[PDB]
Subunit: 86 residues, 2 copies
Amino acid sequence: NPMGIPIQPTYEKCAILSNILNVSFGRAKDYAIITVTNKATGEIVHSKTYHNTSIVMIDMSSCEKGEYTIHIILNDCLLEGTFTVQ
Amino acid sequence: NPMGIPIQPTYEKCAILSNILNVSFGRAKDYAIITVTNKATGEIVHSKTYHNTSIVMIDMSSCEKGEYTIHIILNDCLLEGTFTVQ
């Protein structure tokens, strides 16, 4: 039986509570881009390059309700996730 | 309620069938390291840097049975997964 093997970054983690989005960089990279996009409309609601940063917290409590994608861009790897703003 | 947001690489995927491990690079990078390690013993059973490669296939059919970790190393991101050789 064929089986997918999920792959995840070791050092980058993401979570949300009370519409506060958290990105954690467990080894603080020289550069990381975080871009957050409304999945229904394509509106970019956050896009910033970070330097020497461990914790990024983004308040999504005023944003449109629905699904969003997060992109975290490292050298060349493009990391992605999807989350819900309720 | 707190919620984790799984993050995955966009371009790198992994799967297994009949103990043939497959790694696919959807945008063929200038460099990627693939290292496969027996999780019980720490024995490294594969470790190679690839260049301009789209598909890597690794025959695990002679390897010890049990759990393995795969690491895929890109610029600085360290991607990880776990899989079973039965």
